Amino acid sequence: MISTLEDVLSLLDLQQIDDAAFVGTQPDTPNHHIIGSQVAAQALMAAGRTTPGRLAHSMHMYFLRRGDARQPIQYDVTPLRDGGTISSRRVTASQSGVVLFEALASFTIIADDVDWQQRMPDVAGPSAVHGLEDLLAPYAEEFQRPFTMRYLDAPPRVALDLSDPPPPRLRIWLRANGEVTDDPLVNSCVVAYLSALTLLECVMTTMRTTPVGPRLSALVDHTIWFHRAADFTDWLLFDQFSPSIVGRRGLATGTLYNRSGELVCIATQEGYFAE
Amino acid sequence: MISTLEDVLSLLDLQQIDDAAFVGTQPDTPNHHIIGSQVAAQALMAAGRTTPGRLAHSMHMYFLRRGDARQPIQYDVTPLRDGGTISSRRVTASQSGVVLFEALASFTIIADDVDWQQRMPDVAGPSAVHGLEDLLAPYAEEFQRPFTMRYLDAPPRVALDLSDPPPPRLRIWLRANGEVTDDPLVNSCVVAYLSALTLLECVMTTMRTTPVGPRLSALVDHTIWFHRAADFTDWLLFDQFSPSIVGRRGLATGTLYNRSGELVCIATQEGYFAEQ
Ligand SMILES: [Cl-]
Ligand SMILES: [Cl-]
């Protein structure tokens, strides 16, 4: 099972099998499903390798069919445009000829210009905050990680035992359990992985469910805009909320910051909750 | 020019030239540029016509090349997924084989389930706000509309006169200057049109520019999530802001609400500003 930060870096180590085709693999999962975070990060790596040296700036994706964690995944990249400042790629992810996912990714050259952001919210610092493992301890009977996670708000399983579902806001302090490679594309791919990892949890809580049920979900899409490099040598804050849930779908948006205050990325995804 | 609401509805009338191939058109503009609002709305209509009786729920797109307003646009639709819940469509827009735009759209059945939203912000109403025409009248020498627009925060050209540029936030009350067809797909397409129309303005102000310059801009992408029907028989509030601007890029996000408070859609786009 994915348990170390090195395991996450291994996910990003794709095997090139043709000029614009790459294969990724992973360990099996308990329900045999591939999670969205993996396919996002691997798809971005595949795209980035066909645009060498350019920096990831955005990616949009739709999950069509859910991957089987027992088989590898093939990523086929199509160049859409190669401009002097922006370049664009389609990435299709497949298993035995079955298309799992389609994405569109865009890459840029670095440019010094207006650099502005909203200020990070004023929240309790990571040291004030309970770890996920201690928070889930009472539920151990119902069940190492690549990131330490400290939750400012109740995680979904804890929230399920509150009288009423809390407001759909979830703030998590995150720290890599090891060293992320000093490579801009790897940096962005790890950001991509984190951007989709806990993001639907604030919706699950409002839907009175958790990642393992009782009501199961699947991501329909995921979107990321990368603005500034993540500093994985310290904590990051992931500020997540839902503006709206309707018709079995819940929208979640998250903003990732370095502890030092820089806004790293924004991401948004819609999850579908089985009836 | 596109100047009436009927003209915007007419953008959505596509010629079908094959099973999954449609042609859209538009009047020539002054600089022959086709705006992203038009291409988003026409692409959604194309996609929707191949998924009859399902409701638009999301759309993602990249604007690869600027369109020539003097030529029509072919929308080629590819079905990617079909069945009991969600249907998925690729839409490619092209002019004489040159691809302008790639989108992925998604459609769903109606289902009653958990229905929750954040509360619309408490702001001044439409009558407390000056119309855009009036706010821009002082600058006429430098220069009808399908929508009445009342800006609660300074438009880019007005903001440009201020010493300290304001926060990159922009609330606009909008009202269709006419009746929008009572059809769910048309409704979603007009929502798509609006979702991209003013959305970058909150960035332009921080970038010390306006829709007509001095620093020009182009959209890189656009993204819409449709949750509740727009009620075009009354005002809508488009609450827009930018969380971040860097590297010649500015990200803008907007939430559209009915006056009665329902959250209609969320949209997010990134614009690129050519060197200064
Ligand atoms: Cl370019
Ligand atoms: Cl922990």
Handedness of CA B161, B164, B168, B174 (dihedral sign): negative
Specified resolution (Å): 2.0
- H helices present in B196-247, as ranges: 201-206
Q: How close is the Cα of A207 to the center of ligand 2, in Å?
A: 24
Query: CATH no. for residue B264?
Result: 2.40.160.210
Give the residue numbers spanning the domain of A98. Answer: 1-275
Contact between chains at A90 and B102 (C-beta distance less than 8 A): yes
Q: How close is the Cα of A206 to the center of ligand 2, in Å?
A: 23
**Using CA atoms, how far apart are residues B55 and B39, in angstroms rounded to an integer?**
19
Q: Say which ligand is closest to the CA of A147.
A: 2
CA dihedral A92, A96, A99, A103 (to 10 degrees): -20
In B225-254, the residues whose Cβ lies within 8 Å of chain A are 225, 227-228, 242-251
In B81-140, the residues whose Cβ lies within 8 Å of chain A are 81, 85-86, 88, 90, 99, 102, 104, 106, 108, 110-118
**Using CA atoms, how far apart are residues B159 and B266, in angstroms rounded to an integer?**
25
> Chain A residue closest to B264 (CA)?
A244
In B146-205, the residues whose Cβ lies within 8 Å of chain A are 168
Among B90, B249, B255, B276, the residue to mutate for chain A (most A Cβ within 10 A): B249
Contact B42, B17 (CB under 8 A): no
Contact B85, A272 (CB under 8 A): yes
Handedness of CA A40, A120, B251, A204 (dihedral sign): positive
Contact A257, A236 (CB under 8 A): yes
B121, B191, B236, B265 from B230: Cα distances, Å: 17, 7, 8, 8
Q: For residue B140, give every residue at least 6 positions away whose Cβ sits within 8 Å of its Cβ, in sequence order, or none.
A: none
- Amino acid at site B54: R
Contact A76, A91 (CB under 8 A): yes
Contact A92, A102 (CB under 8 A): yes
Q: What is the separation of C-alpha A90 from the centre of its chain, rounded to a whole number of angstroms?
A: 19
Contact between chains at A102 and B85 (C-beta distance less than 8 A): no
Name chain B contacts of A90, Cβ cutoff 8 Å. Answer: 102
> Could you give the number of structural domains in chain A?
1
- Backbone dihedral region of A202: left (phi > 0), alpha (psi from -120 to 50 degrees) or beta? alpha
- H helices present in B176-237, as ranges: 184-195, 201-206
Q: How close is the Cα of A238 to the center of ligand 1, in Å?
A: 31
Name chain B contacts of A264, Cβ cutoff 8 Å. Answer: none
A236, B111, B119, B211, B240 from B259: Cα distances, Å: 38, 24, 12, 27, 16
**Using CA atoms, how far apart are residues B271 and B25, in angstroms rounded to an integer?**
24
- Cβ contacts from A onto B, under 8 A: 164
HEC profile of A211-223: CCECCCEEECEEE
- Amino acid at site B208: R
Among B61, B80, B221, B228, the residue to mutate for chain A (most A Cβ within 10 A): B221
Q: Say which ligand is closest to the CA of A87.
A: 1
**Using CA atoms, how far apart are residues A60 and A106, in angstroms rounded to an integer?**
9
- Amino acid at site B263: L
Among B244, B248, B264, B275, the residue to mutate for chain A (most A Cβ within 10 A): B244
Q: Which of A207, A263, A266 is facing B114, going by the closest CB pair?
A: A207
Strand bridging mode A263-273 / A221-226: antiparallel
Contact A253, A243 (CB under 8 A): yes
Contact B102, B151 (CB under 8 A): no
